[PDB]
Structure formats: C-alpha cells, structure tokens
Design a protein around this ligand. Structure first.
Ligand code: 3BV
Lengths: 222, 244, 233, 231, 235, 240, 195, 212
C-alpha cells in the first residue's frame, strides 16, 4: 500500500538572545541508510526578519515554507506593506498546519526573529499546529539528544549556586551571540557523533535588527 | 438576453396588488360555481359542471369534487389540470403525516401546506400561479367538521358556508340569508342545491350538470363516511327537494 | 493507490566543470521478466534539458506527454520561445515537482523517481531529483534505485563536494558514469547491458548518445571458482 | 440607442456600445502616464481627490516584485484585475519558478476582459490600465483597454486630457528611450509628460504618484515627501 | 426594462448612481477625525413621537478599535456590519492582532459591487467608518455603494451633507481637540437637522486609542449640547 | 433558478417594489400595539364583509412565536405565515444553542433581517407585510413592543398601529398616550387599545380581536363578550 | 448513562433514571438528570453513547415544542413516540447513527390513560406496562412479571420501583448512584425529590 | 495533563499543570493550559494540545461576536454549548479534548461546565480532567468543603495539582492558579513544582514516601 510519508532526517535548533535570535540546522538530507545530499538547506529567510525551518518529511517541509513565504507576500498586498510580526506569523502558521489536521504536514516547525519590542524570539510547532514561544528549542531526529543539553546550558536547569546548599538557583541571563553560536556548534558536533542521520554541514541563520546573516560550518561526513 | 420576454409574474402593482394573483382570480370567476355548507352533523359539497355536452360520460367523470383522504375532500374552481397537480401533492402530504405520526392529518395542517405551496408561486420562481380555488371539506377529532377555502394568493380562511367560482357574490348573499347554526345535513343539502339553482347561468339545473358529495358521521358509531354522489343519486336528491 | 507494473531501473547522473551528464539503461522490466529492451528513459526537453525517469513506465509515458505539451504551450504567443523565454531546466523541474507532490497528496502518485539534468541560460549546471513522494534534493551526483547505493559512492570519489566540480572534466566524468553503468550490470538483477547517455554542456550543447553497451567486463576469474566451500573440482 | 441595453448586442454598424460606454469611464478618470527606457520602466499618475478634506485616490498597484500597473476609471475593477494579475504572477512563480513575462500578463488580462463582453448578465470592466515591468527581455510598458485590446508601447497616457502627454511622449520618443541607467531622469521625463495634461491645477506633494521598475530595481511606489524631489 | 449592471452613456453604473440618491434622502451622519480621537455623530430622526428613539441604532461597533455610522436605507447596513465584524474578528484569529482600519474598510467595500445578474442590487446606504491602529493612527473613512472609499479628516453624509460639508471645510483644522470636535458635530448637526437638536434625536460617539469605541449616553450628550449653546451665546 | 432583480433602485432613489409592498400593508386590516406599565396589548381589526365565517378554525390575527412572544401583522395574509414559521423555528433554535429563549428585540431583529433579505435577493419580491412583535424577555418584567416593515427597518414603540386607517388611530394614540404615565393596569391598557380601534373599526362586535401578554409566558386571548364589555363601557362614557 | 426504567400504572407513568455519569475510572457526576420534557404531559428518558444522548433528546424536544407552538396543541404520547421512532429509524441507516435508547412516558389527555413506550436506537418501538433499557431489564423484567398489577396506584408503583432499584443496587456490578424518579399523570410532570 | 476547577463559597478556583508530552518524551514544562476568553470567562485544556488550543481560541472569537451582536457578555452555558456543539460535529473524526468552561455572570452566578470531545457537556461544582485527574480528585475530595476561605481554596487547588504532578508521570512542570469572582478572574501566579514540592513537603510535613 502506498505510504505518502517519508523521513528525510536531519535536525534543527533555535535559540533566542536579548537583541538577536539564531535558527540552526544541519544540511544533510537522507532516506533510510542513504545520503541524498550533503548540502540541502532547510533553514530559510522568509522576509520581514523571520527565519523558518520545517524539519522531518522534506516534501511537507518545503510545501509549508513555500505556503508561509506566500502568506507573507499576500499579507503585504492586503495590509499596505505592513510588517508581519513574529507573533502574527506564528498564529498564521498554526492555521496552515491545522488546516491539514486530518492529513498532517509531517514536520517539526521552528521560526525565529525579533518580537515587536526588538527582543529575540523563537516559536516552535508540533505537526498539527500547537505552538509556544520559548528561549530554546531543538527539533528533528536528534532533538532528544540536544534539547536536555540546552535546558542545562541555556536555561541553567539543575544548576545551583556553589556553596548555597542547593537553595539558590543559578540566575537566568541572556547569552551573547558568540556564546550562543558556541552552544549551537557543540550541540551539532555532539549530535553528529551519536546520531547517524545528522552530519555533513551546519548552517546557522542569525537574526538582528540589521537583517539576516548566515554562517556555515563543516560537520563529520560519516 | 431572455429578460426581454419575462412577464415578471411575482411582482407588485403600484397599488400593492399581485397582478397574476388578481388575474388568476378573474379566471376563476368564470369557472363553474362550487358551494360548501357545514352543518352540525356533517358537511355538504355541491358543484356545477361547466356547460355539459349530452355525449359527455357523466358517471365515470370527475371534474369538481376530489378525495384527498378518507376524512378530507375538496371542491375545485378553476383550471382542472392545475388542481390535479395540487391534489396529488395534498394526497402525498396527508400520507407523509400519517406515516410519521400514525394519525390522520388534521384538516388545517393539510390546508396550510397546500396554501403555502400556492404562496410560493406568488413570491419566487418567476412562474405563473395556480389558477385554482379550493373548498376543503373535512373532519378531524380536534375541531370536528371544518370548511376552508384557498385561492391563488395562498391565503386560506374558515367558513360555515362558502362559494367559489362564478356568481359568488349572488351565491354568498343567498347562503347568508337562509343559513343558520343548528342546521342539519339534509337541510344543508337543500340549501346548496337551491343556491346553485338560482345563481346558475343555465336555463334549468339538472342532474347531469352537477357533482355532489357529503361528509357525515352517518356511518356506524363514531366514524366518518365520504359519499361522492352517483348520477342516479343526484337525480333522486334533485327530485326529493322539488327542483325537477 | 497504485502498484508499478512495467518498471525502469537506475538513473544516474553527475555535474562536471562545463555541464552535466545523465544515463539510464534501455530496459522495461515486468517483475522478474526482462520484458522490453528498446525503452528510452532519457527524454530531452529543448536543447538544454534531459529528464531521466525510473519507475513505472506507463507513468513515464504520461510524463513524456506532459513535457511534450509543455514545449507546445510555451511556444504559444511567445516570439522568444527559442531565445530568452525558452524552457529552462529549473522551470521544467519545478513543474514536475509540483505535479509529483500534488499526485502524492491526492493518494494517487506517479510511481517514479526523476532526475532533471540540464544547463541554465546563465551557464549554471542544473541537477535535481524528485520522486513519487514529491521529495526533492540536489547534489553534485544524483542517482535512483540501485544507482543510489552503488553509483553514488563511485561518482562521489570524483566529485565529493562543490569545489571538485570545476576540477572535473567531461572525459573523467563520462568515464565514471560508464564505469558505474558496468557495476550496475554486474550487481542489479533488473538492469540491461544496453543504455543511453546524455551530456548537456554549456559550450557544445546537448549530445544524446544511443545504443551504448557495457564493455571491458571482468568474468575470467569465474573459471577458478568451484563449489561453495570444500569441493575441489 | 436600441443596441446598448447589454454587452451581448451588436449595433447595425458592428459596434458594442456597452464596451464603448465602459471606454468612456476611462476618459473621465484622472490622467496617468507610462513610459520606459531599455533599463527602466516608469509610471506617473495624477491622483484625484473628492475635496480638500479627502485623501487622494491611489492610482498605482503592485502586482509582483518585477511588475505593477496604474489605473484610470473604475477603481474597484482595477482591484479585481490587479488581484487576478497578482495570482497569475504568483502561479508562475510557485509552479514554474518563473517570473511571469509582461507580455503574457497582457494576454491574460485581454482574455479575462473579453469573456465579460460576449456573455449575457455580465458587464465590461470600466477601467484602463498601464502595466509596467522588467522581465527576461528587459523593460516593458503595456496599455490595457476593457474592450480586451492590449498594446505594448514605448510610452503612453490614459485618462482625461491624456492627449497632451501622449503628444509630448511622441515628440520626446528619441530622447527618453535612451535614458539608460538613470532612474531620476526617466521619472523627470514622465513628470514633464504628465504636466502637458494639466489645467488650472499643478503637481503638488500629495497629488503626484510615481512608480518605477528596472534592471536592479524592484517595483516600488513613491508618494508624499518622496516625490517632492520631482516638483 | 434594462440590465442591473448597465453603464450609462456618461460611463457610470445606473444602479450605483440611483443608490446615491437614496443615500441623500437618509438622515445626516457626521464624522470628524482628530489626533486625540475620531468623533461620530448622527441624526436619529424618529418618524413619530411614539417611537422609542433609543432603539434607533445608527451608530455601531465593529470592533473595540473600529466604529461605524450609517445613512440611507439603514436596513441594508446590517449585512455590511455583520461582514465587518466577522472580518475584524477573523483577522484577529488568523494573525493575533488588531486589523487595520483601511483593510477593514476595503473588506466592506469588496461587497459593494458584488451585485448583478451575488445580490440583486447595490446597497442603499453609505457608511462612515472610524477607527485607530498603530500604523496610521486615527482614521475616518467614507464607504460608498460604488465600492469606493475615501479617507477624510471630516465628512458629512445624508440629506444635509453638502451644507454640513461646506461648514466642516471652514471649521476643521489639524489641531482640533476631542472636546472641540464633539461640539463641532453637535453644532453642524443642529444646523442641518429639521427638528430641534436634543439628546433624544441626536447621538454622539467616539473612538480613542485608550478607551476604544464608545457610544455616548444621553446624559453625557445633553451636557455637551448645553455646553455648546452657552459657548455660542458667549460672543 | 429564477434570478431576475425585481427590487431595484429608480432614478429618484426609490425601490418601488418595497414601496408597493407598503401599499399592500396599507390595504391590510388595522393592527394596533399598546404597551402598559406591566403588559402589552395587541389589538387587531377584522373586516365585517365576511359573514358565515367559522371563527374557531379561521387563522387568528395574533400568532404565538414562543410562549413569551407574540406577532401580529398587517398586509398579505399568506406572506405573514412564512415570516411566522421562520420566526418560530428560530425561536426553538435559539433555545437549543443558547439555552435561553429569545429576547423580543432578537426575534424582531431576525424577522426584520428576513424581510430585508427579500429586498435585495434575486428572483424574489419583498414581503407585503408589516409586523408588530410584543412580549417579555426571559426573567424580565419590562414590556417590549417592536414594529417591522417590508424594507427591513425595525424599531421600538411605546404604542403603534399599522394597516388601513392606521394614520387615524396613530393620531389618536399620539395625544391619548402619555410617556410619563403609561396604562398602569391591564384594564387601562386594553381599554386604550379598544378605544383606538373604535376610531376606525365600525362596530365593536366580532370586528375587534384583543390579545393580552403579561410577564413569564402569560398570554391570553379575550373572547367576544369580554371585548364587548369594553365597547359598551366606552360608548356610554362618550355620550357626554 | 446506564439505567433507565419505566412503569405504567392505573393513572400515571413513572420513569426512573440513574444519576451517575461515568468516564473511564472516574464518576464525574452523581446528580445527572437523564430526561427531557417534550411536552407538558410527555417525558422522555434516554441512555446510550456519550454526547448522542443529550443531542438527540434536545433535538426531539425542540421539534415537539415547535409543533406545540405552531398548532397551539399538544401531540398525543402515541404521536410523539411515532415521531421519535421514525427519527431513529432514519438515523440507523445514516453515516453516523444516534446510539440512543429511550423510554417515552406520557399521559394522553383525550383518552385519559397513561402510556409507556420503549424505543431502541434501531427504531424498535413497543408499548409496555413496564420497560427498561440496557442490562437493567435482565433483573427488572422478571421482578415486575411477578409483582406488577395493572390496577396499581402511583404509590404502589413507587414501592414496586423501589424494589427494582434495591435489586439493581444489590446485583449490578457498577455504582449508578441511585435514580431520579419522575411521575407523568393528568396534572403533568413532577419529580420525586426523596428517593 | 492534570486540570481542575471547583466551585465554593468565594467563587471558583481553577488550577492546571503545565506539562506537554509526546509519548514518554517531555516536550514542554511551560504550556499555558488556561485560556483567558474574556475578563469573566476561563477555559481549561486537556488532551490533544492544538485541538484544545485551536478550538478554545476559536471559542473566544465566537464569544466576542456574541457580545458585539447582542451587546451583552455571553453566558457560561451558551459559551460551553458553542464548544460542545462544535466538537459534536467532529464526533468520530478523532479530536481529543477534555475542557472546562469556568466563569461568572449575573444570571448564572459562578458556573463550571465540563465539555469533552465525544460531546459530553456537564454542569457541576467539582471536576478534575486529564491523565492525572484521579490523583487530583483524591486530595481535592478528601479536603473539600463549601465553606473554604479564598486562601485555603487557592492552596487546595494548588496542592491537588502538586499531588497529581508528583504521582502522574504525564503531569508536572508548574501550577497555574486562577480565582474567579463576581468581578472576574484573578491570576494567582505560576508555581514551579521544582521548588513547590520541597516547600510543601517541609512546611506541611507531607510526602513522607519521598527521601527527604
Ligand atoms: C497531559 C500533559 C498529557 O495528556 C495533557 O493532556 C496535555 C494537554 C496540554 C498540552 C494542552 N496533552 C499533551 O501534551 C498531548 C498528549 C497527547 C498527545 C497526542 C494525542 C493526544 C494527547 N500532547 C500533544 O498534543 C503534543 C503536543 C506537544 C507540543 C508535543 N503533540 C503531539 O504529540 C504531536 C501531535 C499529536 C497529534 C494529535 C492529533 C493528530 C496528529 C498528531 N505529535 C508529535 O509531535 C509526533 N512526534 C513528536 C516527536 O517526534 C516524532 C513525532
């Protein structure tokens, strides 16, 4: 019987700073035990300082990104070139996903950018449209590997102040873009080591008020 | 396009009248007179056939009086073909009600639905209205014996005695003169025939130019019987009242 | 919901310095029966694109007709149909990709794996894959079916990343493709010896080679192999 | 007279009066000018107001990053036709990953307007459009009429007193066509062209509406203080 | 007869032009836009003294940040308001934000020309749509049955419109306060109204960023009417 | 389907089909609504050119839409049935979804919305009917009286009349009804309603129908003798 | 939903309906009234699939109330039961049938007789002296076969009903949290508050 | 999920956890399971996350349209019935929702309605909904009285979620508290179970099963 879904592997990662946000994703694309491409980008600039990635089944991922990009275009046409805010984009994406509630897009979607106060924002979606704003989110094949590391290093979970008898927590603070990129690179090298569908290359999209910058790093190709 | 040839059958005049309904009523006023008279122990339906020919088969004929179910009948005035369309619908409606509730349809409910169909043709669809006026004679266990009339407008009203078709003005005056509330069926039979006999456009009223029917409780104990009169039975009742 | 009947096996391809090469054997299999032997599975569109198709042949023929009709439709009210407004490989691919995904979404797929090879108007090499699921990807080397498992490893030794493309000539690239076709004939049970090969170069244009054969095969060592373990004769 | 009740009727001389009356709605509309060089294409539009308390009716609409038009006549009809163009441009992008040719855009508008002139019940569009764009064959300018007739031109003008600007552009043809790699000068030529259609009124800051598209310029519209440069 | 969507020889749609005559017969409605808010006022015009004037609803809320006044065949406005409200709420559902006043007006005006041989005739009512958004601030729009809408600093529609508009031309300036605008609507309404203006036959409303759209009480308007009469007698 | 635009604008800005529907209302028998301090009374004329009528079964002029709301009308009788039916269906639908009976304003707004829809829908003519809708909102003791008309406009009235010679009875009500002090009791409200109809009717025999609605679904129709007592009382006070 | 009983006596119809609403391993409510008044002298109890039960009951209620207003007249229990049966008979061959079983207890004012109708989700109607739906019948029918007499009073019927509830409380696996008892007679419908 | 809401002398308490799971994978510890429909209406969420989230914010839009059309805030009964009638249309399609519509109006007073995805709609004084509902019931029922003070009622609601958060593997994260009065709903903070458990253990002397 024809199975309309497939698994293209890969993993993605979104972190929000004080005045910036990053959305990272490996460039490996796979089916079963075969590599289809070592450089197939799945993190896209969608305009209005919104970056997006829909990881999982690539056909559904591309379809979604394509539809959201198109939604941004028509938002301009219908509302006098108004900038689509990240919160409005998130709500719009929910309706895109939930529109196919009974034949879902097989993807973990993450978007990143700046909120209307200029602060870093990351939103994450389940396959059928439930969303939540967070400081931190890993998605895709190696999400279960990376996410607990992020809880520990970004949100300082389970870390107490030394000598305080486990009474005072390590205080929350925003990370610099330099520190965030260190965590992203270490997260992906660790994921590459222990997950077979993750590797080849890492592509990070950084979002500030100045625009969308890109950075690329090699990953192990085995 | 086709706009050019549209008569616009469902519009108002400047005076607030429906042209086609008014002209349908004008048509009905040339149809053979039909009279309904409601007594305390039954209902009489009497109707005059439209200028009969001597070679017309009289006994196997039905023009004016139709049966809707065992408890309800109608007298027709207007286009017979139009009436039969509505009669079959009314017959089906009665059976739908019986099938749904396991009870014979109350007279007014049937009358309202048939009148609602007529109304529809005056408000939407762009079709001509039905050129028909009915006299409904029937019985149910709520209101007992009932007479109604409906016309092309889809408006219906209840009556003790009523006429439709030709010479209703003269016929209604004569009924209003001799009718009284404690009247019996046999008296109503006589009134119906006497009224037609005076209002007729013919030279003399005869059996071959009439249709007649009664709805009595004259069956055996607490049940209603419909009697559509045969030619010979009309001949006898016409002699019995001294018209011929 | 379908099942493929008459099928075509691997389509293999790679980029080189001035263009792209694509190849596919001329077999139309009917399960284990090697039914049809004159099947052309490389279909040129214009003078700048070749679409290689594997999978169901009835659906391949349907796709042929769509591409044929696309050329006709593009020519309508188009004075620049053979110039600036000619069909690009990227246009042809995106059209097919749209159709493939629409058909999978209606639960009635075209049971194919497709590789669109060509050269864009600006000279850039175009090589992209699409299949029955509407999944798309691009790479310096692309292959379908058994080609993905056996050809890609061999072709990736020549062009392992983007920077290896300018260093790879058409002679070296074609040699690797022809070698890969031999390996597939050794190891794929639904492959044939006869195949077609197409080169799309930004200078010399479209070169379509028909009736090629696998050759220079190693079979002599078979005579020494006796039994399955012990046996000496 | 007797043959103008609807679009489906021909006159005895072979005229379609409803189409001609729709054409008349354009003549009443405010003037708008179109012109192009080899590198850029420019729209200039005189906006009209109801009174001093009202805003000035926006004449120019964007269809894609590389295409857009100006209107003269019934504005709602322009909105319908522009929306249709937006969809067609967008269909070309999503399906073929291909920017819609400005010539095809004209063919599509022609065929959409035509269907409304041959069927009972419908009416012709009551608006004229000047479509500019930059595609794979360079800069373009089209003139759309609701009869269905679309015409590719170097320059033109539609609306009330459009003959003045149209005569000017016919004289200036050899000059403005060679304004290559210079946006501001091509606009100046368009602003001077539309000035030939003015009577009693002059070009003010909230009156003038300019748009441009070209080689390294997406379709963008200029209003308000952004057009003060050209007065 | 003749087609509903027919052009006149002058290049206008007959039915649209005839609907504009119906709007001229309607009761007066005035809107004034300021930097402190937008004021909307209407003439109620009760046909008889037995009619309970507070049931005359010619000023209407579309959303918290958008209000609407009407003039003409006011029964035709009901489906327009219903569409506007649904448009406003639907946009909030899809985008988690308030909808722009212009976009709302454009959505309403898209219904206008959806008539022919869709509904059987154009609307016989004009609307004044007042509101606020973060981008373009306080706005007033005049939505016609032609499908056209103009933004206005001030606008009058209905029977006394041409006289009231000429008055608004002289009186309006860019530095008007909200209180000044309130009195100005009352002043101009009292001029063009047939019967004498009071709190029962005239209604005020406004939309501000802080408090949103509010229809004024008859007690609040009565004090503004009294304040207006005193100021005119004071010079 | 039949598509013709029957209701359309004329050069002077009038919709003649809607205005001709008002003429049908003007032809219809007179109907009056008067609301007191704790009640509403709906009075209706019945023309006396129809003798030999059966008043048991003849459709009554005042119709119950729900147990707490009533609807009378003037104009085409057949048209009124369609509006009444729709109103009754909407009343039950409202109870089903909102778990609360309709307000009189809501029910009026619905009926008025139906009438309006028929003034700009293709293939249909307007209803030749104006209605008076009266009752009490759930758990409320404030009397409600509303009027609708073919165009689709509706409004609340302290007292109102529609139909033939309605301008005469409206003239009467305008001077005899005090806003500051409405009829304090049921008797006062009925009497004022009967008085107003006696300006127009002819005889106070079987020509006047009176229906009294009180709070908490308390609706009752008066009989001939009960109404005749008001007619007898009014005439004796008149001779003065 | 689970237990609905009905007993027709000399001058009235008595309906008893369990108060428990259970979902999974939790009794969510113990005061649920599994009945709707269709008309002043007609009461319908119901049991079956969650959601369907109330949705169906209220849909029937609306229709009967609509009829009552239109005709200014109360439909007979027989007429109501026939209407309900037909709706279920339509439903069973729908895309998604109403999985609802009902008892209709009514007092016919024209006949001056109480009437009890049992109708299952298939549209199977029967008039009975006593009725039950679900597993209740397996205990109550035999009990009533023994103790029921056609000429009993309302008070005798309530004692007979107590005997059923006691037996069910003894032998039924599930805790149904007692019953709400309602009486339908010539004076209309009233609830017994202490049972 | 674990959610509860109970009616008492001083109005309505509403308490929920904040965990979201995909099988045994803890997907989030910071989910908002209370939807603020208007200043007088709350909705709780349990079951399929987007099913709840989507349709309850849709419910808020419908409630807004009601007060625009009717010039009056919607009743709790009518608001709950819009949702129950909606999910009933989808019955059999596979929606997964266990919701509670809580609020105050003049005509009704404080009111709670349980509404679930198979079409069940129930008015009541106490409900617990979710995978850890039974754990919440155990503590809530055994300590519930109508005459609880606002302070004690808030704590009992908090303590009941904590009880479920502890025992139920698919509940946890933090406790969100709400108090509904005649003046509307009042938020009473986010309480992380990480700190709350030890604080409650020490101060109350409970949770003796755990290694102190
Ligand atoms: C308690 C915590 C447990 O039930 C509560 O009931 C909460 C309710 C809150 C969040 C409103 N329920 C859940 O967390 C709920 C449990 C559940 C899961 C599936 C069906 C019913 C109930 N979890 C979800 O809904 C999660 C939401 C978070 C963001 C992950 N979603 C999923 O599990 C999704 C969508 C499930 C689904 C529902 C209906 C149709 C299609 C799909 N599924 C995945 O993300 C799949 N999975 C993620 C891991 O990577 C492999 C793919």
């Amino acid at each position: 019987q024809f199975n309309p879904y497939g698994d293209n592997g890969g993993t993605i990662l979104g972190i929000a700073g004080e005045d910036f946000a990053v959305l990272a994703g490996d460039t490996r694309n796979i089916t079963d035990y075969s590599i289809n491409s070592r450089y197939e980008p799945k993190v896209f600039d969608c305009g209005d300082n919104i970056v997006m990635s829909a990881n999982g089944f690539a056909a559904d991922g591309d379809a979604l990104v394509k539809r959201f990009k198109n939604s941004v275009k028509w938002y301009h046409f219908d509302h006098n070139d108004k900038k689509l805010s990240i919160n409005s984009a998130a709500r719009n994406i929910q309706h895109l996903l939930y529109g196919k509630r009974f034949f879902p897009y097989y993807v973990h979607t993450i978007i990143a950018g700046l909120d209307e106060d200029g602060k870093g924002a990351v939103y994450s979606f389940d396959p059928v449209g439930s969303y939540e704003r967070e400081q931190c989110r890993a998605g895709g094949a190696a999400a279960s590997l990376i996410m607990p590391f992020l809880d520990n290093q970004v949100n300082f979970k389970n870390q107490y102040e030394p000598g305080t008898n486990g009474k005072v927590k390590k205080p929350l603070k925003y990370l610099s873009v330099e520190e965030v990129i260190k965590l992203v690179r270490d997260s992906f090298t660790s994921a590459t080591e222990r997950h077979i569908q993750v590797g080849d290359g890492l592509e990070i999209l950084i979002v500030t008020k100045d625009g969308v910058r890109k950075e690329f790093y090699e990953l192990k190709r085995d | 396009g086709s706009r050019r040839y549209d008569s616009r059958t469902t519009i108002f005049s400047p005076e607030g009248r429906l042209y086609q309904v008014e002209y349908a009523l004008e048509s009905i006023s040339h149809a053979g007179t039909a009279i309904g008279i409601m007594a305390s122990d039954g209902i009489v339906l009497a109707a005059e056939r439209k200028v009969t020919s001597t070679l017309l088969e009289q006994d196997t004929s039905t023009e004016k009086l139709y049966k809707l179910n065992d408890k309800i009948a109608v007298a027709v005035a207007g286009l017979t073909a139009d009436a039969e369309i509505l009669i079959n619908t009314a017959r089906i409606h009665a059976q739908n009600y019986l099938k749904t509730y396991n009870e014979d349809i109350p007279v007014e409910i049937l009358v309202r639905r048939l009148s609602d169909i007529k109304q529809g043709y005056t408000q939407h669809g762009g079709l001509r209205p039905f050129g028909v006026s009915f006299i409904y004679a029937g019985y149910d266990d709520r209101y007992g014996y009932q007479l109604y009339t409906s016309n092309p407008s889809g408006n219906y009203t209840g009556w003790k005695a009523i006429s439709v078709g030709a010479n209703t003005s003269a016929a209604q005056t004569l009924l209003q003169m001799d009718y009284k509330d404690d009247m019996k069926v046999d008296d109503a039979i006589e009134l119906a025939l006497k009224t037609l006999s005076k209002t007729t456009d013919s030279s003399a009223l005869t059996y071959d130019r009439l249709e007649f029917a009664t709805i009595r409780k004259g069956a055996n104990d607490g049940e209603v019987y419909q009697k559509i009169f045969k030619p010979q039975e009309i001949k006898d009742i016409l002699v019995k009242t001294g018209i011929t | 919901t379908q099942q493929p009947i008459v099928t075509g096996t691997s389509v293999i391809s790679m980029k080189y310095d001035n263009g792209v090469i694509i190849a596919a054997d001329n077999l139309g299999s009917y399960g284990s029966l090697l039914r049809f032997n004159g099947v052309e599975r490389l279909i040129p569109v214009g003078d700048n694109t070749v679409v290689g198709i594997s999978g169901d042949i009835s659906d391949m023929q349907h796709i042929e007709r769509l591409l044929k009709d696309l050329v006709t439709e593009n020519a309508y009210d188009n004075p620049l149909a053979d110039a600036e407004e000619a069909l690009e490989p990227s246009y042809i691919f995106e059209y097919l990709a749209t159709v493939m995904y629409q058909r999978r979404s209606k639960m009635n797929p075209l049971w194919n794996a497709i590789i669109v090879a060509g050269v864009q108007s600006n000279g850039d090499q175009f090589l992209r894959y699409v299949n029955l699921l509407g999944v798309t990807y691009s790479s310096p080397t692309l292959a379908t079916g058994f080609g993905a498992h056996m050809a890609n490893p061999l072709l990736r030794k020549v062009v392992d990343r983007e920077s290896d493309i300018p260093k790879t000539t058409v002679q070296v690239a074609e040699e690797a493709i022809v070698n890969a076709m031999r390996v597939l004939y050794y190891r794929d049970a639904r492959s044939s010896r006869n195949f077609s090969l197409a080169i799309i170069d930004k200078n010399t244009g479209l070169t379509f080679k028909k009736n090629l054969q696998v050759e220079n095969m190693k079979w002599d060592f078979a005579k020494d192999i006796k039994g399955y373990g012990t046996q000496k004769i | 007279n007797n043959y103008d009740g609807d679009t489906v009727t021909f006159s005895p001389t072979g005229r379609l009066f409803q189409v001609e009356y729709a054409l008349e709605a354009i003549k009443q509309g405010s003037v708008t000018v179109g012109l192009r060089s080899n590198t850029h294409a420019v729209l200039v539009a005189l906006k009209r107001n109801a009174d001093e308390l009202s805003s000035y009716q926006k004449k120019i609409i964007k269809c894609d990053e590389h295409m857009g038009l100006s209107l003269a006549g019934l504005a709602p009809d322009a909105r319908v036709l522009s929306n249709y163009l937006r969809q067609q441009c967008n269909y070309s992008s999503l399906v073929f990953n291909r920017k819609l040719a400005v010539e095809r855009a004209g063919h599509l508008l022609c065929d959409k307007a035509q269907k409304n002139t041959q069927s009972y019940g419908g009416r012709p569009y009551g608006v004229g459009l000047l479509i500019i764009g930059y595609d794979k064959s360079g800069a373009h300018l089209l003139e759309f009429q609701p009869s269905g007739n679309v015409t590719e031109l170097y320059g033109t003008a539609i609306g009330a007193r459009s003959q003045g600007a149209k005569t000017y552009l016919e004289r200036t043809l050899d000059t403005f066509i060679k304004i290559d790699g210079n946006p501001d000068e091509l606009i100046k030529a368009g602003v001077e062209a539309i000035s030939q259609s003015l009577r009693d009124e002059s070009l003010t800051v909230d009156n003038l509406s300019i748009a441009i598209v070209g080689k390294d310029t997406p379709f963008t519209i200029y209003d308000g203080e952004a057009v003060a440069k050209y007065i | 007869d003749r087609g509903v969507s027919t052009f006149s020889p002058e290049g206008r749609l007959f039915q649209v032009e005839y609907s504009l005559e119906a709007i001229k017969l309607g009761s007066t409605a005035i809107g004034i836009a300021t930097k402190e808010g937008v004021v909307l006022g209407v003439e109620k015009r009760a046909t008889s003294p037995l009619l309970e004037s507070d049931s005359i609803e010619k000023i209407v809320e579309i959303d918290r940040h958008i209000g609407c006044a009407m003039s003409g065949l006011t029964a035709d406005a009901r489906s327009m308001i219903e569409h506007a409200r649904t448009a406003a709420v639907t946009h909030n559902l899809y985008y988690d934000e308030d909808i722009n006043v212009e976009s709302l007006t454009q959505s309403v005006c898209d219904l206008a020309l959806r008539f022919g041989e869709l509904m059987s005739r154009p609307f016989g009512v004009a609307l004044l749509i007042a509101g606020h958004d973060a981008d373009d601030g306080y706005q007033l729009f005049h939505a016609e049955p032609s499908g056209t809408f103009y933004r206005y600093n001030a606008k009058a529609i209905g029977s006394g419109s041409e006289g009231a508009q000429a008055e608004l031309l002289n009186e309006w300036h860019s530095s008007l306060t909200l209180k000044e605008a309130e009195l100005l609507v009352l002043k101009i309404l009292k001029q063009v109204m047939e019967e004498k203006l009071d709190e029962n036959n005239a209604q005020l409303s406004c939309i501000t960023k802080q408090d949103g759209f509010k229809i004024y009480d008859n007690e609040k308007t009565a004090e503004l009417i009294k304040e207006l009469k005193e100021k005119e007698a004071a010079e | 389907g039949y598509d013709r635009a029957l209701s359309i604008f004329s050069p002077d800005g009038h919709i003649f089909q809607v205005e001709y529907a008002l003429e049908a209302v003007k032809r219809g028998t007179c109907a009056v609504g008067v609301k007191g301090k704790n009640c509403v009374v709906l009075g209706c004329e019945r023309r006396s050119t129809l003798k030999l009528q059966d008043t048991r079964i003849t459709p009554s002029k005042v119709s119950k839409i729900d147990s707490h709301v009533v609807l009378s009308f003037s104009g085409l009788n057949a048209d009124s049935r369609i509006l009444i039916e729709k109103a009754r269906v909407e009343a039950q639908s409202h109870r089903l979804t909102l778990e609360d009976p309709v307000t009189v304003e809501y029910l009026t707004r619905y009926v008025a919305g139906v009438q309006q829809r028929y003034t700009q829908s293709g293939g249909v003519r307007p209803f030749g009917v104006s209605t008076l809708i009266a009752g009490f909102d759930p758990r409320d003791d404030e009397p409600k009286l509303y009027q609708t008309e073919p165009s689709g406009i509706y409004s609340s009235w302290s007292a109102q009349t529609i139909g033939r010679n309605s301008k005469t009875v409206r003239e009467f009500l305008e001077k005899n009804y005090d806003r500051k002090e409405p009829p304090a009791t049921v008797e006062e409200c009925v009497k004022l309603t009967v008085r107003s109809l006696l300006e127009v009717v002819q005889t106070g025999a079987k020509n006047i129908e009176i229906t009294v609605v009180k709070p908490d679904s308390d609706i009752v129709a008066l009989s001939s003798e009960e109404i005749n007592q008001y007619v007898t009382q009014i005439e004796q006070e008149k001779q003065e | 939903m689970d237990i609905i009983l009905g007993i027709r006596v000399q001058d009235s119809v008595i309906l008893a309906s369990s108060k428990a609403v259970t979902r999974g391993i939790s009794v969510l409510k113990d005061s649920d009234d599994k009945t709707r008044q269709l008309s002043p002298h007609t009461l319908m109890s119901f049991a079956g699939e969650a959601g369907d039960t109330v949705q169906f009951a209220e849909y029937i209620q609306a229709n009967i109330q609509l009829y009552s207003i239109r005709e200014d007249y109360e439909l007979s229990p027989q007429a109501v039961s026939s209407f309900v049966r037909q709706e279920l008979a339509k439903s069973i061959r729908s895309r998604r049938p109403y999985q609802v079983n009902v008892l209709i207890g009514g007092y016919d004012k024209k006949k001056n007789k109480p009437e009890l109708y049992q109708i299952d989700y298939l549209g199977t109607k029967v008039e009975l002296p006593y009725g039950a739906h679900g597993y209740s019948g397996f205990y109550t029918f035999s009990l009533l076969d023994h103790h029921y007499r056609p000429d009993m009073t309302t008070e005798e019927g309530l004692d007979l009903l107590k005997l059923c509830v006691q037996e069910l409380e003894k032998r039924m696996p599930m805790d149904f949290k007692g019953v709400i008892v309602k009486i339908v007679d010539k004076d209309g419908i009233r609830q017994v508050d202490d049972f | 999920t674990t959610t509860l809401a109970f009616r008492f002398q001083g109005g309505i308490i509403v308490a929920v956890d904040s965990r979201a799971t995909a099988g045994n994978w803890v997907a989030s510890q910071t989910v908002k399971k209370v939807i603020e429909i208007n200043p007088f209406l709350l909705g709780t969420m349990a079951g399929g996350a987007v099913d709840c989230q989507f349709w309850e914010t849709w419910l808020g839009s419908q409630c807004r349209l009601h007060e625009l059309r009717e010039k009056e805030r919607i009743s709790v009964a009518a608001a709950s019935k819009i949702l129950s009638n909606l999910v009933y249309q989808y019955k059999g399609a596979g929606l997964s929702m266990g919701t509670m519509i809580c609020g105050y109006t003049r005509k009704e007073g404080p009111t709670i309605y349980y509404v679930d995805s198979d079409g069940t709609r129930l008015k009541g004084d106490i409900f617990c909904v979710g995978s850890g509902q039974t754990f919440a019931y155990g503590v809530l029922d055994s300590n519930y009285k109508w005459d609880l003070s606002v302070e004690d009622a808030l704590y009992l609601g908090k303590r009941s979620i904590l009880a479920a958060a502890h025992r139920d593997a698919y509940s946890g994260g933090s406790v969100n508290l709400y108090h509904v009065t005649e003046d509307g709903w009042i938020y009473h903070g986010n309480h992380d179970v990480g700190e709350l458990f030890w604080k409650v253990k020490e101060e109350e002397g409970s949770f003796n099963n755990v290694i102190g």
